[PDB]
């Protein structure tokens, strides 16, 4: 009993009478490469994936490359394996070109889009700089994926973006204690005249991040939206409860997302203070519990089982005396 294949069977196309004439892999790497190519390709049989799933610009760049290739000193250094590339410069001009798409990839991986906009994706075109000032000299940056302690995020951060109205919103997606889907609002500055952020209307006062102890890592996202024309908007936790999806839906017409910057935070000492005097509540504490270990149904006669078998099914290790 045989059933014909439901599609092209692999290795069928290359199957020839003459095999000596055909070129072969001579290296492990060549086969490997072709293997990943096949793995990524869709298949009619059951797979692992199923179950576990400008002209002027070009000319200018070419000219620059030619000029860079012209020098002898750089070539010498390259040969000597001493040549270095400045990280500051490359970062600066990377943020301009290939920045937004990489940020999009990060946001996609962290699943911000699915939680915020219910699957909808946007490219964070405008560069956004958020920094939490610590002391009078130091400042902790907020990149995409960075981890910042709530102690450092106690005060409102400095927001700078080189652009010419705007709005910004900081949201904690997993911060919510009651409703899993819902998020906590932190601070929503609306109608921001250009780069200058101080002039903006304070819809909601700043509240520092409060991830509960033993609740794991919490992600907080700053979302910057471009505003076409002015529009009217609108310590208790209930008031802070919001969904970004609904808010954006109702403000879709006059307001579109432009920038994204997200950081991570664990519980810290400052969170206790946030809970105590600011929220005027007892601090919730969580712990990671695992499901109870599986044991098969106890038998009257455990055969060829060690003595310790019985200890698997007893609740208390202290001795019992029954009626006596």
């Amino acid at each position: 009993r045989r059933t014909p294949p439901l599609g092209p069977m692999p290795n069928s196309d290359i199957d020839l009478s003459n095999l000596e004439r055909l070129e072969k892999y001579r290296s492990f790497d060549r086969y490997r490469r072709r293997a990943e190519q096949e793995a990524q390709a869709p298949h009619w049989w059951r797979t692992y994936r199923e179950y576990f799933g400008r002209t002027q610009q070009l000319l200018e760049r070419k000219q620059a490359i030619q000029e860079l290739r012209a020098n002898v000193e750089e070539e010498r250094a390259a040969r000597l394996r001493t040549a270095s590339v400045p990280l500051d410069a490359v970062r600066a001009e990377w943020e301009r070109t290939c920045g937004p798409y990489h940020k999009q990839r990060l946001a996609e991986y962290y699943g911000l889009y699915r939680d915020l906009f219910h699957g909808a994706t946007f490219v964070p075109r405008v560069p956004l700089h958020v920094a939490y000032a610590v002391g009078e000299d130091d400042l902790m940056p907020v990149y995409c994926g960075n981890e910042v302690t709530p102690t450092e995020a106690a005060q409102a951060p400095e927001v700078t973006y080189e652009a010419e109205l705007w709005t910004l919103l900081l949201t904690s997606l997993d911060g919510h204690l009651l409703e899993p889907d819902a998020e906590y609002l932190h601070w929503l500055l609306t109608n921001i005249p250009g780069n200058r952020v101080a002039e903006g209307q304070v819809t909601c006062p700043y509240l520092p991040p409060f991830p509960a102890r033993g609740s794991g890592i919490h992600r907080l996202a700053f979302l910057l939206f471009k505003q076409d024309q002015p529009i009217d908007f609108s310590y208790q936790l209930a008031q802070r409860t919001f969904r970004t999806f609904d808010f954006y839906k109702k403000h879709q017409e006059t307001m579109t997302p432009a920038g994204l910057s997200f950081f991570q935070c664990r519980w810290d000492d400052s969170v206790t203070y946030i809970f105590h005097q600011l929220l005027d509540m007892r601090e919730p504490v969580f712990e990671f519990v695992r499901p109870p270990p599986y044991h098969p149904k106890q038998k009257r006669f455990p055969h060829r089982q060690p003595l310790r078998y019985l200890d698997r099914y007893r609740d208390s290790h202290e001795p019992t005396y029954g009626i006596y």
Binding site: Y31, R34, A39, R46, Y51, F286, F288, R290, Y294
Partner: protein, 101 residues
């Protein structure tokens, strides 16, 4: 009469430790969350559902004879083997409130 074979077919719930298949030779290769014993027997590393799939076979580079076979294949050729997987059914754990401090 060694009684070797598949013990758990596709769609069967397994617990960690459960022996999926005894084989003598590598008929079924270990896939996701499936351990392999000394005797070449396959066992579940996780509690879940057993799946059988066809996956592209890339041997370890140190495995001399397999690499030799690979390097003798034509340019379009890829090798496939049967693989046993366990799709885990339960999450690692949950966070629950213990103290309203």
């Amino acid at each position: 009469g060694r009684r070797q074979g598949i013990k758990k077919m596709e769609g069967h719930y397994v617990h960690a430790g459960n022996i999926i298949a005894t084989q003598r030779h590598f008929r079924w290769h270990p896939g996701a969350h499936v351990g392999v014993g000394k005797n070449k027997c396959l066992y579940a590393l996780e509690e879940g559902i057993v799946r059988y799939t066809k996956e592209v076979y890339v041997p370890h580079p140190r495995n001399t004879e397999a690499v030799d076979l690979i390097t003798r294949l034509p340019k379009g050729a890829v090798l496939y083997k049967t693989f046993v997987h366990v799709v885990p059914a339960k999450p690692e754990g949950t966070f629950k409130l213990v103290a309203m401090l």
